[PDB]
Amino acid sequence: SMLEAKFEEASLFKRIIDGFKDCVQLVNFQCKEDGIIAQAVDDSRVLLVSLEIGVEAFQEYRCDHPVTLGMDLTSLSKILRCGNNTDTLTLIADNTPDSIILLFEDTKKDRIAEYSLKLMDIDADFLKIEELQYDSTLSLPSSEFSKIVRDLSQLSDSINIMITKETIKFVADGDIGSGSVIIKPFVDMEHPETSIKLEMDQPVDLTFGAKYLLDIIKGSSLSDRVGIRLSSEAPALFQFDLKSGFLQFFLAPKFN
Amino acid sequence: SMLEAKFEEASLFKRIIDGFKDCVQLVNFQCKEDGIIAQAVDDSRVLLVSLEIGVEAFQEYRCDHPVTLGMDLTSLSKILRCGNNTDTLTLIADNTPDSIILLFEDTKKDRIAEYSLKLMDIDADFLKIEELQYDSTLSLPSSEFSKIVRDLSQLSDSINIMITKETIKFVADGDIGSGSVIIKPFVDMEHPETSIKLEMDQPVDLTFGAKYLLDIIKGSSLSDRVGIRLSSEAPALFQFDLKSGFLQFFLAPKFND
Amino acid sequence: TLSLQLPWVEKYRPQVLSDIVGNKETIDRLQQIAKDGNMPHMIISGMPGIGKTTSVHCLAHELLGRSYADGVLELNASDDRGIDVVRNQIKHFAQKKLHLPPGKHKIVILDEADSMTAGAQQALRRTMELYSNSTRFAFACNQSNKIIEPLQSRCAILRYSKLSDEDVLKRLLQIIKLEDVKYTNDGLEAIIFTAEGDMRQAINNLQSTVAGHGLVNADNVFKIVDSPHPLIVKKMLLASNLEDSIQILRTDLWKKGYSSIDIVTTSFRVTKNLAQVKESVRLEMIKEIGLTHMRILEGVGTYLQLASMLAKIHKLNN
Amino acid sequence: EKRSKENLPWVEKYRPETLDEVYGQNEVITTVRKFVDEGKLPHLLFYGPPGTGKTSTIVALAREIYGKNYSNMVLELNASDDRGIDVVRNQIKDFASTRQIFSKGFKLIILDEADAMTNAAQNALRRVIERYTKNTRFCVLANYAHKLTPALLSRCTRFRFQPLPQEAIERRIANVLVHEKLKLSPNAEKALIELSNGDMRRVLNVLQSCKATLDNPDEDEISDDVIYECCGAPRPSDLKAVLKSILEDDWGTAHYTLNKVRSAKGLALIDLIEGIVKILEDYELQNEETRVHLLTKLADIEYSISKGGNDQIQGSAVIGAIKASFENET
Amino acid sequence: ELGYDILEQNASDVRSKTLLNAGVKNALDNMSVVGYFKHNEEAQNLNGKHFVIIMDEVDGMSGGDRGGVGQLAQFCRKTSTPLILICNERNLPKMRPFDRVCLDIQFRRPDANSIKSRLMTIAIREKFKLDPNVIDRLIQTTRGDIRQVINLLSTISTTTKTINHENINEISKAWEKNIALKP
DNA sequence: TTTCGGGGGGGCC
DNA sequence: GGCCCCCCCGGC
Ligand SMILES: Nc1ncnc2c1ncn2[C@@H]1O[C@H](COP(=O)(O)OP(=O)(O)OP(O)(O)=S)[C@@H](O)[C@H]1O
Ligand SMILES: Nc1ncnc2c1ncn2[C@@H]1O[C@H](COP(=O)(O)OP(=O)(O)OP(O)(O)=S)[C@@H](O)[C@H]1O
Ligand SMILES: [Mg+2]
Ligand SMILES: [Mg+2]
Secondary structure, eight states: OOEEEEESOHHHHHHHHHHHTTTOSEEEEEEETTEEEEEEEOTTSOEEEEEEEEGGGEEEOOBSSOEEEEEEHHHHHHHHHHSOTTSEEEEEEOSSOSEEEEEEEETTTTEEEEEEEEOBOOOOOOOOOOOOOOSEEEEEEHHHHHHHHHHHHHHOSEEEEEEETTEEEEEOOSSSTTOOEEEOOBOOSSOTTSOBBOOOSSOEEEEEEHHHHHHHHTTGGGOSEEEEEEOSSSOEEEEEEETTEEEEEEEOOBOO | OOEEEEESSHHHHHHHHHTTTTTOSEEEEEEETTEEEEEEEOTTSSEEEEEEEOGGGSSEEEESSOEEEEEEHHHHHHHHHHSOTTSEEEEEEOSSOSEEEEEEEOTTSSOEEEEEEEOBOOOOOOTTOOOSSOSEEEEEEHHHHHHHHHHHHTTOSEEEEEEETTEEEEEEEOSSEEEEEEEOOBOOSSOGGGOBEEEESSOEEEEEEHHHHHHHGGGGGTOSEEEEEEOTTSOEEEEEEOSSSEEEEEEOOBOOO | OOOOOOOHHHHTOOOSGGGOOSOHHHHHHHHHHHHHOOOOOEEEEOOSSSSHHHHHHHHHHHHHGGGHHHHEEEEOTTSOOSHHHIIIIIHHHHHBOOOOOTTOOEEEEEETGGGSOHHHHHHHHHHHHHTTTTEEEEEEESOGGGSOHHHHHHSEEEEOOOOOHHHHHHHHHHHHHHHTOOBOHHHHHHHHHHHTTOHHHHHHHHHHHHHSSSSBOHHHHHHHSOOOHHHHHHHHHTOSSHHHHHHHIIIIIITTTOOHHHHHHHHHHHHHTOTTSOHHHHHHHHHHHHHHHHHHHHTOOOHHHHHHHHHHHHHHOO | OOSOGGGSOHHHHTOOOSGGGOOSOHHHHHHHHHHHHTTOOOOEEEEOOTTSSHHHHHHHHHHHHTOTTGGGTEEEEOTTSOOOHHHIIIIIHHHHHBOOSSSOSOEEEEETTGGGSOHHHHHHHHHHHHHSTTTEEEEEEESOGGGSOHHHHHTSEEEEOOOOOHHHHHHHHHHHHHHHTOEEOHHHHHHHHHHHSSOHHHHHHHHHHHHHHSSOTTTOEEOHHHHHHHHOOOOHHHHHHHHHHHHHSOHHHHHHHHHHHHHHHTOOHHHHHHHHHHHHTTSOOSOHHHHHHHHHHHHHHHHHHHTOOOHHHHHHHHHHHHHHHHHTTO | OOOOEEEEEOTTSOOOHHHHTTTHHHHTTBOOHHHHHHSSSOSSOGGGGSEEEEEOOGGGOOTTSTTHHHHHHHHHHSOSSOEEEOOSOOOSGGGGGGTTSSOOOOOOOOOTTTSHHHHHHHHHHHTOEEOGGGHHHHHHHTTSOHHHHHHHHHHHTTTOOEEOTTTHHHHHHHTOOOOOOOO
């Protein structure tokens, strides 16, 4: 077995999968000697998911040469649900793989469960996510953002984020009135987690649909602070930092 | 009356009937002086159900001569739903009866509900298919078996069970992929209710339909443990023991080809 | 007594394309495709007992070798093949990743594709196109008209012809040689005569003989086998006199146990395809036969009604 | 059932139990017995008219193969049970793809009256039959072969059940008489066979009715008269007299004779028409148009009678049609 | 050719009102992340950032797609991006909702003089002889179907290396397209 | 257009 | 998972 990844517990893998399972259907992993990366484009070709897990998230990791594995989220989630939460999950793949093996091992009951998942053929090349000079780099706690988007989605089907001098406006003009929320740079010492920081360079005003933002916030439980990078005209970058790695959502804006 | 059998709580009989109502259509009870033994065969002639409620499960049980009662489980369940879950249930029958009387009595009040279900002329024998010497006999908690069956049935419509020396393997091979679960015998003196026992004579490898196992696992609500007995050239036995009787599912394996 | 013997239809089902008799051109094309590869989307059409399923299975087996169990998805009328099945299971199979020799592809066999609904056939359209570099489709049907035009456009048409007497005789002689079955020429001629180009029926009757009486001769075959009643109906409807037609109807059909509805339906079908009689006469005969058929359907099915139909037919043909 | 077999109708009381109790189908019985005695059992099809012994034969064969417990080792379906596409795809497939529960052996599926099944179910049955042939055998029973699809017929070995012969009917009648302690006159047996039309059910029903008719069956003998009164059928003498009067008397005499003959025993006109047709089909008519007119007009009258109408007008039409048709003889 | 990014939905997708109003709808007025991340280094390629919706096989929308036709008709009049619908037969009652909400473009059967050079090129590359005089006949065999005629050439060339007048009759008779006639 | 019956495919629950 | 409803064929 050329790829022999071994998570400490199956909780981590299932949590990352659930972080972005509801927005995509097919995913493609490159596993190398440095870790695992994944890029997925939604059926609507609007939302891009970019996940990477470093070698520090695995108790053991070995990969002779790079491996590309195409999989479907539904089947992977179904196979993962079978194994218990408190087991050791090993991802095994051989040379020129046609399927990926998931081994759930419980050392207490001494139980081994092997599930082989057939890989899909995905030809779409990964889009080069080259570093962008984002005009605005907002960062806010996960709970605040989750609550704000959930509340605003009920009023309107899309929300406009405006970043200006010490001002963050989540306008939600729509069918139900024009209820909006406003925040300003805030800092706390007792709990630095609740530290809203703004690093604007040029004023930003970008509107995004409610469905994609709802899907993104669905993964808020996977982190504590969300980093929202916005530009004058470019996809917005929503970053959740993991214990070892990250999960990004690139969401394209709407016309005008 | 010829036959009078009282259940202290109607929930007992409702639960027993609920354990095998989703796999058979017509049931045949045959009451004796040593309890009530019932059989039911499914429409596909692939699964058989045998229940042997004993006399110790009734407050009082009186039966003069053996009496046969052919019934439809749908109507029986329909009427049993009528009665409350806090009333005593008397099963009453007469000599060569034309109907079976279910009498729900609530001691709290003076309300008595009598339901007469017309019987069917079901003439069949049991044949006592309990092949003497099996090839393997395992016993394990019903919860683990139910979990394994539910997990594997989602992969394929067929499940293969292999019994080897100190090894029990459940395998499913579907379209999206395959899944294998291996369990070895172990014992815990602290909590023997969770132990797994295996007695082996010759290796076994038998395939079964997932639908029938999904139907069978519904009996786990009656017993905390399940005993599976397997033997080549014979149907597989799935036994759930009860307070005084048991419920047995005889499932025919699929042809290998 | 409780052990069954494998029927000759399954015991000698061709396992290689070289053992399929008839349709020499198409079989040669399939053999060359197997030799080279690059199997295209194809639709094999024909009539019962000619070797369509055998041809498709042999082609798939010889093409995919050891990878038959992983690169072949077979579905028939005994399996659910609705819109959901096409949109999920077949799509997943086509999108599956599998390593195969240079010029080999996964095969999706849809036996009896005629029964498939229009929705499933429409859904298959873009699936056969987006994944044509890894998966190919082989439909087998009896009536090609039941397959929608867009699907026919994407596949190669392979219309099979009925096996001639020579090919049936060749395969039958091979089977006899393998099973060492005593036979006579007249028995084989009778078997072919009853077969009507159906190899399955020929083999079944050959087994019934030998199994029933032993030596294969016309006598035993006709003792167990009956001459096709359509020929009897044709002879009845072509008799020069009403007396002869009534005699045939009584002796050969009514006293043999054939139902009136069967007789009238066969008469209709035979009259439809009597190329030796003028079209107008056939149309008048069909009108009379339809009147009699309606009377029989109403419930009045008797020998007298069929006799009256024959009398009216002879009235017209005079 | 209830009580002993003596409470059952004769049609069911005398149902063949073994394969040696089936009469009139010697060839088919011998062939199936040889097939079962050597393990060479193919997919069988039994095509035949009503009351010939197809169900009895298949049940007897199943009993021979399995034994007294055949009901627990076969899948029998008929027109009373739903046999849709779902049934074929689930129940039949499960039965064919699974081992026997009770005792080892192959699986037998008896689709009685398969001509009532829809085209979709028959089409779905094709690969089901062809794929599990190693461990399962299919038997089909039919009265109308036009309802069965060509493919299903191609997959089955056909056996034709002929109308029951005269000798077989006499042997069965002899057995029934011996068991029932009855006496039957030779002419009574002749009439019974003639009216049976090759159906044993009719024979048994008419014989039971005749036994009921007799006041003291213990020593009374069944005569042709008993059959005629029981069934209400015209006597041959009555038909001959009616035909004679129609053919060589004037309209008034023919009308009077027909009315008197019918009112003597309340005979029905349809039975008279059938009897006269049978008598005339043996005549040697010089001219073909005579036979043509007879057949056409009598068929029209029979069809009209089938839907009610006026009885007197129908009888007069019969008389006039016969007279006009025979006028062509010259 | 115009630089637009293609979003496609075929009959293999369930195009019902419930999922149509929750899927492609959002893309009617949204940019393409693929376009931005793929054309970031390009210049003057504005269309790269836009969407072009292609609904293929609209006539194939069976009962599995409830209310899809009406939703497509509504989108046709309220779409912010170019939308192209493809169907085989336009004169069905079921296609009435698109009566006067789209620009209708008819594609007629190509003539035998339009694909002639293509057939010579295919013959030259595939190393088999195709006499031009029998090309026309083939077009009538498939009723002006280019895919069908190419498939016919591929299948016949497998064993027959010459398509001439001595065998064209057999191929034409064995590959005849049986199209059901109309009222 | 159109008088039952069977099958499919979606919508409440 | 199960009713409940609507739509569509039906010969060879
Ligand atoms: N060309 C053939 N050569 C030898 N045997 C044949 C041939 N065709 C049919 N048979 C025999 O008949 C049996 C059945 O053949 P099939 O391939 O099932 O016919 P089929 O045309 O596919 O049936 P349909 O169209 O679904 S009714 C085979 O197993 C063979 O034993
Ligand atoms: N060959 C026979 N020998 C003796 N009795 C017969 C025979 N055939 C029919 N019968 C009698 O008639 C009764 C009915 O016979 P069946 O087996 O039901 O005929 P069947 O041909 O299967 O009826 P159909 O075709 O479904 S209307 C039997 O109980 C027998 O008593
Ligand atoms: Mg076939
Ligand atoms: Mg019968």
